[PDB]
Design a protein around this ligand. Structure first.
Ligand SMILES: NC(=O)C1=CN([C@@H]2O[C@H](COP(=O)(O)OP(=O)(O)OC[C@H]3O[C@@H](n4cnc5c(N)ncnc54)[C@H](OP(=O)(O)O)[C@@H]3O)[C@@H](O)[C@H]2O)C=CC1
Ligand SMILES: NC(=O)C1=CN([C@@H]2O[C@H](COP(=O)(O)OP(=O)(O)OC[C@H]3O[C@@H](n4cnc5c(N)ncnc54)[C@H](OP(=O)(O)O)[C@@H]3O)[C@@H](O)[C@H]2O)C=CC1
Ligand SMILES: CC1(C)N=C(N)N=C(N)N1OCCCOc1ccc(F)cc1Cl
Ligand SMILES: CC1(C)N=C(N)N=C(N)N1OCCCOc1ccc(F)cc1Cl
Ligand SMILES: O=c1ccn([C@H]2C[C@H](O)[C@@H](COP(=O)(O)O)O2)c(=O)[nH]1
Ligand SMILES: O=c1ccn([C@H]2C[C@H](O)[C@@H](COP(=O)(O)O)O2)c(=O)[nH]1
Lengths: 547, 541
């Protein structure tokens, strides 16, 4: 290498970008890409009032130093300048407008060497402990004279534009604010060939927005204990086959990422695991799956709504399904009249006949979820019957227990009624929900005996997440964790190519779910009581690719 | 001038010890069998052999310079002497004991402590020595990564006596053999264990690998990226219970905790550090968390906890009682199995509003749901033959006829019958999975008393997996344990703190009488545990 200025001087950019108005931004038919998050500023200030978690991120990154790693950095810089060889601090560079946007109580930025770029102002115009430079070149001369750890370009847009076009940035630390505000300055459109995303953080809520932290990297375009690790892996040739192979190069992006901390990676990593280590099994008439047995996902509903972003999902159907369940309905026609076709195939004359339900009316699904939720143990007759005060009203029971016996270890909703399995159109995939209450917070475990990772699971995650919110609210609690246990976890072979596409997509910050807060009984919700805010997602995928 | 010679020249011992012939008390000295009649005590353990090969062969050429620099400084020298391999040192008996076809040991500087024979009869690359002192001389003049003392007894004895050993790479063979020669008693004060491997089956024995270390008293680009993602972690606020982790010195002093028993101990450590303080229906406190998974590989071991003593006659009798479909508490009481006694008292049933239920009539619990799900429960004496759904019969038929079915569940949580039960089932369901003639089992437990309950529960369902596997001509693969409400009783904490500071032993094995091929034909005599090496019993209360 002919060492580059950005690598010698460790020059990084840090920014936060929200989404922008854009003539309503198309409206619902909207395309999303990394350029969706581009809003920097409005009227010489930030577009948002306070996002404290971003502020705390920005301070920790820009203040953090590692003394032991100075030796190697001084040598490199001294070598580069062909030269021989206080508390160590980072340098932070601000345009004059950026500097003027910062309230006085914050500046100069604590535990940091403050640098301001200006032509109009000179050192005589500042009271503060700051360096003025009038030239990008004077910054590089200055880093050559100073003891510092890393150099952070803090914006604004004009400063971002010139440091990027000069190829002076080695990584961009980029906050995605997943909300829309009025903006009049924007971050430069990043060239996907110059910079690639290498890391994605967990998703958080701060001040009524979700947000995450991504890292772009510029492209090329007691030691003793370490050996004991090698020894303990003398037998790792069984997972070194990765039985199925499916080729490395099909996951360049997935495998390129260094930190994969976005909760959507719980889903994508299970799909990777099944693709590389799954067992080949028969399924039905030849169809074919890769299968594994026993996974757990955990989703923090206090921080986000885990609606998958690596493809497009609609929730109207699965919400109409959940309301249908809560009503205790088994009538397929109710959903079909709402153009929800989830249960259509399971209600046909042929499907019911092949289940031996010869005496069952078309779209009479029998004693499935709804009936077990409101009437477990009652004799199923038909889908029109009035089952009032027949069987156990489980739903009512668990709402009572959450409200009056919250430390109970017996708050389960169970759909797997052994007596009734053969009368069901098909037995339930979603066996039981158990609830947990601590400190005014409701968590839900859902055990799923059979899990179609390609099609079913993304919707099942959404269903039980919404359900946790509904139970949390009618019992006066805040939603905490939704915990999803996978028994038979499988990828249909038909889905494999579609999933390969999806695995190489980078998740977006999750949306948020809003419930009408006036709804105080589980029975009183209707479709318009549910709102998904700030859903940023990749393009729709048909998992079939054929029909 | 404060540097051990052992640290300079990097002298490690590597041994394999089985158990020896004669309630038994176990300790690290339990495992001391080395040899028998100038030969290994056992026919052939291919996994110990494989481990041996790798550890003694392996070098890191990128880490040698730092070694050559501390070494040549020490000898009051500067240069190499006046492809990097390791050094391997054998006693003469140890040297002869090897079948010729292994000698000299591939890719290794073979040495031989022999006061008797000399260079004469042997090539170059095969050094010989008269004293221990003359080994240091030869390492002083050599290019070698690390020096491994390969035994035998006399050699370990005198190398350990002369404080010359930096670490002991110690294989525990968990079977008994006839033996002439033994490893010395390793002083708990001289040495300490810093690492425990996974447990393995090789040649009809379980074994693990542990590391003793001599006691000290007696791209960084993405290294910073890692710290940025921790910007929002709680430091001492998230370690939010003052259980005082410095009471777990042993637990926290181990580097590598790969023994499957750590799946249990780590969950206890987690609920102690991060658990939520709650009341419960007994009124004693708990620390509780929600949602864990443990997986045990039944093909390699029987996961009976070793960090305390467990008894299994009672839990097997419970299981056989379930399989029979019994709900009669008295059957168990008359066999001195008292698991369900408290749940069958007049006072307990009355407080459960079961005023019309006879003592020790537990109602439609496990056994009744497994063999009669949906039948109308009358009393514990009624004949229920061919009433309700025989789930146990059904899961076995599905395993044999439809093994790729995703509907092989055994469910005890009969919502209709809960109020009639002495108490609702803690063990909600079992799901089964068949691949390549191998049976795995998930058991979902809604309520988990770590400490008293869960250790038994692992054993119960591990045994059941073996029984269903046998009668379906399958091999057991994984038992997978999902914990919903996972709690440590505050009255258990002092006892668990003692337990976490104990190092597991290699697991035992379960042998079933192999003639049994119908789930109903098992009897208590059909179950044996082999090679159960355990720490002292603990009263959890
Ligand atoms: N969301 C985020 O992460 C961030 C948002 N912001 C916001 O961005 C906006 C500010 O951005 P913007 O308007 O582009 O202005 P900048 O903050 O980029 O500052 C521009 C000014 O800096 C000086 N300058 C820049 N480059 C040079 C140079 N090479 N040599 C000499 N002087 C130079 C000039 O000062 P002069 O005119 O005095 O010569 C120039 O007018 C505000 O809304 C602020 O709130 C800012 C940083 C980060
Ligand atoms: N379990 C394990 O990991 C291992 C077990 N073994 C087993 O142990 C037995 C071998 O142990 P053991 O019988 O005690 O024999 P050793 O292998 O310890 O060899 C003893 C002989 O080595 C020589 N020797 C010992 N000390 C010195 C010294 N200080 N200076 C010069 N020569 C020395 C002498 O041979 P001479 O009289 O010729 O000078 C001595 O009689 C066998 O049954 C073998 O299979 C062996 C290796 C590993
Ligand atoms: C937006 C922000 C702070 N976050 C990220 N990720 N990257 C940045 N470059 N940022 O801007 C740094 C300069 C602006 O500073 C402030 C503005 C308003 C204040 F009230 C206080 C401050 Cl300190
Ligand atoms: C027991 C053993 C092999 N394993 C461990 N962990 N530590 C040791 N010191 N070992 O002994 C090494 C010398 C013995 O070598 C052989 C004996 C018989 C053979 F047929 C082949 C060989 Cl190589
Ligand atoms: O909500 C649902 C319903 C169904 N399935 C999938 C799992 C299996 O692929 C199939 C059910 O088939 P059985 O396991 O019942 O055979 O449907 C889901 O993933 N989620
Ligand atoms: O095999 C068993 C039976 C019971 N329990 C524990 C869980 C709780 O500590 C208690 C059951 O009481 P409830 O959770 O149902 O209140 O018994 C176990 O851990 N294992």
């Amino acid at each position: 290498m002919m060492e580059q200025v950005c690598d010698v001087f460790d020059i990084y950019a840090i920014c936060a970008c929200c989404k922008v108005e854009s003539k309503n931004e198309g409206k619902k038919n909207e395309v999303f890409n990394n350029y969706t998050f581009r809003g920097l500023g409005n009227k010489g200030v930030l577009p948002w009032k306070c996002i404290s978690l971003d502020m705390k991120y920005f301070r920790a990154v820009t203040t953090y130093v590692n003394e032991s790693k100075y030796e190697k950095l001084k040598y490199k810089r001294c070598k580069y300048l062909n030269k021989e060889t206080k508390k160590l601090q980072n340098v932070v560079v601000m345009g004059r407008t950026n500097w003027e946007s910062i309230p006085k109580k914050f500046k100069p930025l604590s535990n940091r060497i403050n640098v301001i770029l200006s032509r109009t102002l000179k050192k005589e115009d500042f009271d503060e402990d700051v360096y003025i430079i009038n030239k990008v070149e004077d910054l590089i001369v200055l880093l050559g004279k100073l003891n510092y750890y890393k150099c952070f370009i803090l914006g604004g847009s004009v400063v971002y534009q010139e440091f990027l076009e000069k190829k002076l940035i080695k990584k961009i630390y980029f906050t995605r604010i997943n909300s829309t505000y009025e903006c009049d300055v924007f971050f430069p459109e990043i060239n996907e060939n110059e910079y690639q995303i290498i890391s994605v953080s967990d998703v958080y809520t701060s001040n009524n927005t979700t947000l995450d932290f991504i890292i772009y990297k510029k492209t090329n375009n007691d030691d003793e204990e370490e050996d004991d690790f090698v020894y303990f892996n003398f037998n790792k040739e069984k997972e070194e086959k990765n039985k199925n192979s499916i080729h490395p190069n099909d996951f360049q992006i997935y495998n390129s990422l260094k930190y994969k901390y976005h909760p959507e990676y719980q889903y994508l990593n299970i799909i990777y695991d099944i693709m590389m280590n799954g067992n080949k099994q028969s399924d039905r008439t030849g169809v074919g799956v890769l299968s594994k047995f026993g996974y757990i996902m955990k989703f923090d509903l206090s921080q986000y709504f885990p609606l998958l972003t690596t493809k497009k999902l609609f929730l109207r159907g699965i919400i109409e399904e959940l309301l249908w369940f809560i009503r205790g309905e088994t009538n397929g026609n109710t959903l079909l009249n709402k153009n929800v076709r989830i249960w259509e195939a399971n209600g046909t004359r042929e499907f019911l006949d092949n289940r031996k339900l010869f005496h069952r009316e078309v779209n009479d699904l029998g004693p499935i979820y709804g009936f077990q939720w409101r009437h477990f143990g009652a004799e199923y007759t038909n889908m029109y019957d009035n089952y009032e005060n027949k069987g156990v009203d489980q739903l009512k029971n668990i709402i009572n227990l959450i409200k009056n016996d919250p430390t109970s270890r017996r708050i389960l909703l169970c759909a797997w009624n052994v007596k009734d399995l053969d009368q069901m159109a098909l037995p339930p995939c979603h066996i039981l929900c158990q609830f947990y209450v601590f400190d005014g917070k409701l968590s839900c475990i859902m055990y799923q005996r059979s899990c179609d990772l390609g099609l079913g699971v993304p919707f099942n995650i959404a269903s039980y997440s919404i359900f946790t919110h509904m139970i949390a609210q009618v019992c006066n609690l805040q939603p905490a964790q939704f915990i999803h246990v996978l028994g038979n976890a499988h990828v249909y072979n038909n889905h494999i190519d579609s999933l390969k596409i999806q695995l190489n997509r980078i998740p977006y910050p999750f949306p948020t779910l809003k419930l009408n807060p006036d709804i105080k009984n589980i029975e009183d919700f209707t479709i318009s009581d549910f709102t998904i805010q700030n859903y940023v997602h990749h393009e729709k995928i048909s998992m079939d690719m054929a029909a």
